[PDB]
Design a protein around this ligand. Sequence first.
Ligand SMILES: CC(C)(C)NC(=O)[C@@H]1CCCCN1C[C@@H](O)[C@@H]1Cc2ccc(cc2)OCCCC(=O)N[C@@H](CC(N)=O)C(=O)N1
Lengths: 99, 99
Amino acid sequence: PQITLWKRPLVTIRIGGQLKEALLDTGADDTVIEEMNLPGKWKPKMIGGIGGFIKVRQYDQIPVEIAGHKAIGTVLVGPTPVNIIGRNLLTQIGATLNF
Amino acid sequence: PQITLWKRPLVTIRIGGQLKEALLDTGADDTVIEEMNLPGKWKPKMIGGIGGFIKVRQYDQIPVEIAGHKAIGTVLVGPTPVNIIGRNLLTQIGATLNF
Ligand SMILES: CC(C)(C)NC(=O)[C@@H]1CCCCN1C[C@@H](O)[C@@H]1Cc2ccc(cc2)OCCCC(=O)N[C@@H](CC(N)=O)C(=O)N1
């Protein structure tokens, strides 16, 4: 689909068999999801954003369905203000910026 | 044009008569520019993200050229690690997400 930016590019995603809302974020290198229970092992990690660094749980090869499109990759779980889908997963679904 | 997301979507912009490299960010509601002595009246503001909040100066009606595309709107100047072009200006240049 073609998405305009007059409103936040929020879409429904399915992760861990659970539906959630997430922001298509071209300005994010990684995908960061709000604290939740994901199966499998995780390694501690730190990522930075506008107001500093935060500690997150890194889960690898996690299946994520974005607007019906399949992706399998790294998902960081931590105290983020909103769920964001970053470039690591956006590239998997062939997302591009056009103008 | 069409921009892929293999790398950070960095483009050249022109603000206050200066050329800068900025990030096209669909996840940013506002445009945040690195510290610079821009002329004009401003109002104190606090914006948050991953990381917490940072203090910025809000400047309205600032002419910004993005890849040859003229635009004008609110620009927040503060201690940001990178120049961020948010949705407030992306909509003006007709930018869209496609997948
Ligand atoms: C207006 C304002 C910029 C404050 N909004 C945001 O930061 C909102 C808040 C809610 C969640 C999404 N973010 C936008 C998101 O694109 C932000 C904006 C941004 C901040 C700092 C950056 C680069 C981009 O420097 C490199 C810092 C490394 C980086 O890419 N950080 C990403 C997250 C990540 N590690 O994948 C990020 O926070 N991206």
